[PDB]
Symmetry: D3
Subunit: 149 residues, 6 copies
């Protein structure tokens, strides 16, 4: 019984309210930005589709992250705004639940997939786009307690 | 209006894509990682496999993305001690009417998310940064690089 | 803005939902079905199982739908010769902050789609009609019926 | 080797261009209609979300329909309009591909799930809503050839 | 030494085929339940035969380094062998691609077996899935292979 | 007689646990490949052990009448037994719910085995998955059960 892959046993940990908020950014290029403001490259609105994709991702997290716990989610929010001046798209997501485990991954993942979704909705205009700074901003509940960046 | 771009008209040509991602480590992260993980298993070994799997699940995560038959997938996950970084690279190949830039980008992203998952117990200040396309080729498009 | 409705605040109460669907048959469909299918297997046996499975996959099909632990699923698939109809009914139960009307509606819909798949070789004029909620109960909501 | 469930062998059938178009309707009630025109019951725009859900469904078809063939899809279109006067929401989808098998199910399924999605986006306003007349409108390619309702 | 999905880009898409089987040893209690039609959960074999077909289609999702594949065909047969008190599962999967379908056929049986077990464990938790093996395969380089 | 997901609504959510194992018979060629680190696809056991964990989480998706479940824990161990020329797989799954986790544990091993097979079939297509059985289970009504 060495240090090998395993899903930590949290059977005896209580069922407390958990939450987590994350964010991701997408660095745009002129062409990219030009298209976005024109409504996309013909596939639909990048932000609208990516926003829904980010929510769906939150629900598929345990399917993408190997040692992650399957959890019923009680809430999922996702914001996908365009920071016109900075040439950036900003995604932020907040997930909530009632289980023995946290939801930092459901939050982190929601942001990464919505980021990938914006990329797919605009790579035809420019493939140099970059997804940057995907990071956690807060979480609460359980034992660790509150946390903010 | 949203929609999956019709490509029935185009032919099956070889397609290849290569991307990469970075996870910025905190000493607390790098120390755990080096001692074998935070107690959940080698963070990198798990990230790499999760990356190959993410490439296979791409079309089910990216809404307008085209379902394709992956013909090859490589994923590299390496620790850069001096840089306090985890570098991830993925190459996806296929034969179809569309590129695999998503599969590659997705493989890197999810691998990164897995590095985060295997180390966040040591630090939640970990940052996934620069998931970007390095190389791509095939069909009409042609060559392209960072 | 789209979003999965926060219910962390509410308690886990028993929840139940019952829906149904109909597939209008053409003589060409009913004749195949009665002879055992169009050659792919009992259309109804397959529809019923597909329905139970659809109930389990609901949250992955309905975007804002809440992930829940299903605690029970019943699906009935019956031929109504005189009516040239296929009647489908599904009841889903659970214990959580939200109802299972989707699971039940989804179970019926997909079962219906399966009846169509097992018979369309005989007729593509088959119609899925009236997928609707029959009964529902649990928590704040209370009773409700067609 | 009797008449039991099986995925028909189409290995020796050629790879021809296939297409299929289907449609589904959702009968609304006043409350339902009132909310839809007001932008939904708080979860987002029913038509916008259902439209994306219908596309995604098209890709999960083989996962929902037991004896259905796994196929690379080459195209997917979905229309989700509100027929204000008839108190109906009309969904229509068209799928395309290049394989030995048709895509009538990818089309039928896209419509049924988008219908379910509109239901979920409005059941809070009225649960009496009904999904009706999900049917095929056309298909082409392969052997059967053209077909229209 | 690291894991990966083998590059088969330059290989030609041909007719591939694989056939594997699986066995489920039945205890007397479980066999009796099977003959009565199951523990009231449903018909063990009927449900299992379907689980195998669906299974085969989810193969690439369960085997990490497996290649995703459009399947041209899937055949599954689940039978009872009273005398040996065993359930037998045979599956033949067919495709046109650069890689074989041994995994789809192999997984088809394993999961079908797992389903027999689920449908009867209420009677005997000790039931065993005894033999999941490849019987035949064909297509491409190595050509026809037989057990 | 029709199939269905058994109603367990009125049962209490308790600590459930199940442990099952699986074996993979190795031919001399395959064993040799295993000791060298595999056929160049990656480390058979490492990859398999992960496939089992993921597998267990996809259980409800593969077994038709199975109950979906939040899993509190999943343990998988994959070892080589040179002398018997066998790979052994043990999996223990844990949850808090109205139903047992025998399927999650049972499927964890079967799929892990299927993965060993995938990682080594290049060397020997004849490798066999010989024994997938339940070793222990606990929680609820029947309580502790042992092979
Ligand atoms: N400006 C420009 N637009 C393009 C080009 N190719 C396609 N488009 C537009 O963008 C859409 C295609 O999106 P892409 O991301 O390039 O390809 P895709 O196959 O749709 O998406 P994936 O399956 O995720 O790879 C088309 O329907 C057009 O609306 C191009 O070369 N230049
Ligand atoms: N260094 C360190 N390790 C911890 C700490 N808390 C838990 N661990 C270790 O890491 C494991 C928990 O991993 P987490 O990612 O925090 O939680 P998890 O539920 O296992 O993982 P998720 O389901 O992905 O959220 C424990 O079983 C220990 O092995 C901590 O505060 N510091
Ligand atoms: N008018 C009205 N609106 C409600 C009621 N309950 C919830 N809502 C609104 O509708 C949203 C909830 O949608 P519902 O479909 O009822 O429940 P849900 O859990 O979000 O959706 P499912 O997980 O698919 O069952 C809330 O966020 C509010 O915006 C209600 O009782 N009356
Ligand atoms: N009565 C009748 N049966 C047909 C016809 N064509 C095919 N069949 C039978 O039905 C099977 C084909 O089913 P289809 O649904 O048309 O095609 P499929 O590829 O098997 O099914 P999908 O993947 O869901 O599209 C054949 O293998 C025969 O068993 C037809 O024109 N009339
Ligand atoms: N010794 C031996 N090695 C082989 C043979 N064929 C392929 N290999 C090696 O094993 C790898 C191929 O693995 P396989 O499992 O046969 O095929 P695969 O397509 O990669 O795997 P699947 O998609 O799961 O079928 C090659 O990249 C080589 O490293 C063979 O016939 N004999
Ligand atoms: N003979 C016998 N039958 C049982 C027992 N427990 C349950 N049953 C019967 O089998 C059904 C339960 O099936 P199980 O497989 O034990 O449990 P399950 O939760 O339905 O199935 P899973 O979700 O796959 O674990 C009940 O509805 C009864 O029909 C038992 O202990 N002995």
């Amino acid at each position: 019984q060495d240090g090998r892959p395993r899903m930590v046993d949290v059977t005896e940990k209580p069922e407390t309210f958990r939450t987590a908020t994350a964010e991701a950014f997408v660095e745009l290029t002129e062409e990219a930005l030009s298209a976005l403001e024109k409504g996309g490259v013909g596939k639909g609105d990048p932000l609208v589709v990516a926003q829904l994709a980010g929510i769906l991702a939150a629900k598929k997290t345990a399917d993408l992250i190997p040692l992650c716990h399957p959890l019923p989610l009680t809430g999922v929010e996702v914001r996908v705004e365009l920071l016109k001046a900075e040439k950036r798209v900003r995604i932020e997501a907040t997930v909530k639940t009632k289980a023995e485990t946290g939801v930092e991954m459901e939050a982190m993942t929601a942001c990464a997939v919505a980021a990938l979704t914006v990329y797919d909705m605009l790579k035809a205009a420019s493939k140099g786009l970059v997804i940057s700074q995907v990071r956690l901003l807060h979480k609460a509940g359980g034992k660790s307690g509150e946390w903010r960046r």
